[PDB]
Design a protein around this ligand. Sequence first.
Ligand SMILES: [Zn+2]
Ligand SMILES: [Zn+2]
Ligand SMILES: [Zn+2]
Ligand SMILES: [Zn+2]
Lengths: 797, 797
Amino acid sequence: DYIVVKGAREHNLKNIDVKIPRDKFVVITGLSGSGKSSLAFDTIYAEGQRRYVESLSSYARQFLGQMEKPDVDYIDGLSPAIAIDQKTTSRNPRSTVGTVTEIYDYLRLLFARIGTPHITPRMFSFNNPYGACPECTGLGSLMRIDPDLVIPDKKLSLAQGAVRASGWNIANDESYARMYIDALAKHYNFSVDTPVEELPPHILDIILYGTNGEKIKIEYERENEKGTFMASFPGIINSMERRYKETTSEVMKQYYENFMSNIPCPVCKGARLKKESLAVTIGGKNIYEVCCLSIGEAKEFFANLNLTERQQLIARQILKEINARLGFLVDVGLDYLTLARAAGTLSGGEAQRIRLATQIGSGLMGVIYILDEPSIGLHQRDNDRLLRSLKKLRDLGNTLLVVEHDEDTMYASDYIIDLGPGAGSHGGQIVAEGTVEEIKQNPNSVTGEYLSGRKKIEVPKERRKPNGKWLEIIGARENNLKNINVRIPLGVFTCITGVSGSGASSLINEILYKRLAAELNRASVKPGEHDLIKGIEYLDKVIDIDQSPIGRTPRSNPATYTGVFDFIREIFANTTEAKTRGYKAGRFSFNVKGGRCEACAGDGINKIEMHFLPDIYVPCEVCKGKRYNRETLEVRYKGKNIAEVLDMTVEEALEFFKNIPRIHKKIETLYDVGLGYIKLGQSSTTLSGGEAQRVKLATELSRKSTGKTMYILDEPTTGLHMADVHRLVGILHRLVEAGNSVVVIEHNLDVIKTADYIIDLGPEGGSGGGLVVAEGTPEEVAKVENSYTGQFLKKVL
Amino acid sequence: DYIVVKGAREHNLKNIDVKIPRDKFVVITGLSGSGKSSLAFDTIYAEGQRRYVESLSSYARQFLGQMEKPDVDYIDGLSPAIAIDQKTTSRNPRSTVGTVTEIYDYLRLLFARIGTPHITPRMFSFNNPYGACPECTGLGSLMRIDPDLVIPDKKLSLAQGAVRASGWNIANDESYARMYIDALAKHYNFSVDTPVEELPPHILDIILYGTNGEKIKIEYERENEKGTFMASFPGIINSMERRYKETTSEVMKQYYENFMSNIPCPVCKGARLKKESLAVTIGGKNIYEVCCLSIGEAKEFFANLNLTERQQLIARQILKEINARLGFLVDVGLDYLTLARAAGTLSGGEAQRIRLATQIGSGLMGVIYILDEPSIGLHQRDNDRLLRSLKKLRDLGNTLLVVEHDEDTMYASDYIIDLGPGAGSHGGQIVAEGTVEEIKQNPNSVTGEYLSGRKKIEVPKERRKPNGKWLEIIGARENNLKNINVRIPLGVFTCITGVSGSGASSLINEILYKRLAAELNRASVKPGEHDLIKGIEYLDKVIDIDQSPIGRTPRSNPATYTGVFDFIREIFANTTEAKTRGYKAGRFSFNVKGGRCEACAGDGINKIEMHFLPDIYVPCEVCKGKRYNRETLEVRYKGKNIAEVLDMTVEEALEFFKNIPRIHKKIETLYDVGLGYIKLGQSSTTLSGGEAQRVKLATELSRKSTGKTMYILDEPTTGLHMADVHRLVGILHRLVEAGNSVVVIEHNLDVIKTADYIIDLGPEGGSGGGLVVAEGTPEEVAKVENSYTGQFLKKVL
DNA sequence: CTGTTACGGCTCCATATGGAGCCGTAACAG
DNA sequence: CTGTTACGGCTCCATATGGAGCCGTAACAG
Ligand SMILES: [Zn+2]
Ligand SMILES: [Zn+2]
Ligand SMILES: [Zn+2]
Ligand SMILES: [Zn+2]
């Protein structure tokens, strides 16, 4: 009846152990990336997944992949578990919101049972060929490439290579497309220098859609081989379509869709079903009409249902389940959604909420549920609704482990596990355990210290004012915006906030950023609706802050990203011993040959292949992971070597380089970034989202002052303790005082309190918004009665 | 707290419903393939697997495969479940008995912690390259092809095609190997007519192992293409090795291993580890020495452990877990096994028992466990041990659903679910529910009828005697046989039985059957140890009875298998209307063109492809599944058509053809096969193991009398009710009275009682046997005190 | 009339080159 | 000394033909 773990040594697990009670509401929190989150993510979940997947069918076990065994000694009292992560999937257009909502099939069954034609339940579905629209083969649209995007260079000759698609080059002899181009030219007797615009329509059709698969001879003359073969040219369009059909990568899919556009099927149009299916009328509405309705209006519509007595009797189960699913969806809070809406077009938090609602509807109790950041992407009322839903799910009879930072969740929690006190070598130990009251009584918990109010976010005594430099965006009607006009000043720590799903963040991410990037940084991406933008001359450069990893290659290090490695190499080159040895400054760098270990090429790992086992990585024995030649490593400066510096700690580095101001300024920048515990040479892939964000903000701070720069941060409060939030707020204020501009779209109460100009967009999400709710100083905004954000700010202040 | 299902319509589920209590021991039983087993296998398990796999990671969901949705209305109160099926997997040689037993890692950790060199725990393992034997790369053997099996025809010329391996033909110009042969001949200037024996050693080495990958020109002259290319010939051996490495099919793997043999690595030899690893001595033994020990002797060895006080203190967990695992393995009853034994070399029942033991050791409680036929492959004492283990696992806190026929399991069960009364259209309804007592009180349950003793297997009043015709096998020492001599008479319903894992069944399946097949049916398979076989002239033909499907293609039907379709076609051809129409007798057959529907080619299904969906099968609209042309189907004989006859029922067919003795004799043979409920034209793939066995026995019965035939049945009692066992026994007696011979190796008490001559091999499984325990009439055998089977027979009698 | 063998026909299963992002280096301007 | 731009180099990710078993048909013997 307990989750007992002993001898855990994952990452920074200092052989910690704890007894987790079953069938309760326990929350684990700590410092940003302190290791408690990693432990909870990768010890219990990994043990359960291994103990389950293995015991399953062997073939399915290798199909789903063999999970790596953990370093924990033994785990007792475990159970099968599910993970509601934050990394969404592109999925396929065949997937639908109703399909993943576990409501489309129920709606189809209800329509088949109760609805009348103007009758098999299979015909109501749109995934089986027994009832499909042939025009779009059930897809709803028509993914066709754009002839104006593949080879728009009409004036360019055929030999010039107007078509820029990969594998279709015509100016390269070594290209695989050169043989096909030569065969087509032989079959057409047309000069390759003819312009694309001047090409005959028949020749253009043959090039695009192929030569109807007729027999044709293609000549091949390689360096050491020659001959000819009979084949057919499908054409550029057909080749691209086949490649897209055979594609299985999200990046390749996005690249291919960049040159294509799915034209909504005109025959069916949001139906993807046979005409006669729409004839089934239930309550004077169609299945598509029901699906396109909003969740709240759908609940209202199904509440006013009225039919025959037999229909009511048969509805004692189907309609009851439909009502329960609608109520669960309402409790999720994502009312600004449609059953017919595209599954892919959704936020990560929205996807997590939808998955939670589907799990609640399923009712599979007696399991372990591990969620991540439920508070992210929700308003205060949404937080209350999520807490109620979590309490209900716990009442269903399962033990839940959540990781978050919302104070209300901790108050509603039963047992709290805190790991600290610091991060890395400064933490990794269980500070305390028990309920909230004794956690507050505990004087060794940083979370308890923040709860007790000893350290609190003091509201600023003074607020900055605009300097007359404003950016004007008026008439934008992208997504759900109803031609809204917003006056956004620049030069202060202003922010935009509102209820969940209002779309203001979508507007900022899809219109303003795209326009600014196209204007300044020359980014060729089509933006959304945009009438006019003013104040363009005020700013010069714009940058973005996201959660993307700094680098996907192991050839990069955070020291390289910050550039301190260059100063270190220069200092090493300035050494008298280095000058005597004649070593170049470039030799003190692992990225290039000259000093790197030739055995592993500086990678530090070796690949070993087995007949019945996958690739195995082991440390390189020649250089023992030092990634430096012995002769190069023989140099010593101030009692330290280049390898030692690369393996050194930032906390030690700050005290080490007390006489190197050039390096020191970046050192103290990194220290003020609040990431001194991070290794100076940690692997780039090993970095977490918080670490990457800290690195990016440190790099931004180290940048020279310009006074005409703007920054956009997407939910910086995600994955951060209250002290981390305070540090981030201080960094934001110092960046604003530097002379740049800050744009923030978040929902943290402390961040809103620290703001100087609040922008409100509402008054409801989805179709219920599109108008600027209010604007002004936070004190003036709190005076507005018709604003949830204003009421929350007034309560906070 | 209940498993509630309503509106289930899977196969023959007549909208049945039932409430299954949770956390109990409930057993479901019924007629052979009555549908209750299929329901329990494919309703609850399918619902749980879907509700789990889906909610998991999406990418893993498509990796493991999307389970099809069931036809049930809704399932309430479900839980994640695991399935211990009977279909084993070939797996890989890297897999080990200790690995799947979850004991190899524990043993390695114990050896690392306690053992002393003559020290990292990773070096003890044999799956990581950090400690491996390079000779065999951890495999233990060396899978090399046999030069005496690839092209043994030394006298055959190179052009003749001595190498019979697929893709290496030399006598076929169109073969892909012809170009390589021509290139090799050009590079060697050797005549293709030279004998393989007369080929120079250098030429043979070049052919086998390749030409060291050197540059070579291969000429190609196709019908419409020509040219040449520079490439290298890896050789026959290298090509076969690469194909085996790239192989991913069990059938292809078996075909390739038919020409290969894994020679035990001589460097390591049952070690696959680095020399220094064997230096670690624990209790005066090696890790391999511990693994090769029997389970019981290993438990005894670890019981006498004695080390330092620190070792004992550290062993409070590791040694306790090892002892618990050993005790669980002992409770499994598979004492005749070794930790170092090959994982693949095991029986299906042994694999199921091992999986059950591993699951018990895991301790993941609060789940649903569905096993199949625990009694199969076990002795009476093993049945008691399995019942105790199941009771323990239920005490661990999980709800178990077992399907079996052992009376002891029903007695130990709490709730029993019986579905009947018949099969197919004659059953599919819940007969009764409750405990065993009220089940016996219920007069409508066939299981209760058998339990009450109203219908019982009467012991035969007289037993047949040998007619002096005997088969003598003496000195066979295959597997664990210790040069045993057995006198097996022929001409009576004799049988061989013993304790589980004795190996006598393995001896019969690996020596006697192989020798008989090679002698009579000309089967070229190498048998095991065999000194001499006598009485060969007594028998003429030998046949085998297994659980393999009758046919993997949908072009075959049970009517075609039994041959009644030929008589039906002849009768239809004899019709006056058919003679007037001039239709040939072959037209009344769907297998060939002439009368079949050209739209579906007689398949009856159509394939529809979608861009984002897999292949979909739908009934063919042109012929509506009748699989006959309209003009051909227009004929009517005795008020019925050929399509109607093909779709008719056997129970109706027996009354239909009362004036057709030629067909009637096979009709009543099929009826006596006890499978009248089966459709006369059911799909071959749709047939179950019991149905296939019934079909095979019916075909054997319909065979003309010869008096010199023998039959071998492998566990016919599997998947059969007590009445089904009675019917099978009666069929066996009638087959024996026909004039043939019957050899049975099973463990059913009723089958043993019905036997006339019992062969006993023991006295213990594995290394504890190899000697004939006893022999004689069942009454005389019961008088033997030193025989578990004899004691069981005496108790039964 | 029945069993066996041989042959033909059918079906299902099996087996290397181009592009984007990042790091290091050189050059130019303030 | 510092910031910016341009170029070169490096790495990781991406995109049809032969064989075994079965059914139907013809021929031959009892
Ligand atoms: Zn359409
Ligand atoms: Zn190295
Ligand atoms: Zn070896
Ligand atoms: Zn058809």
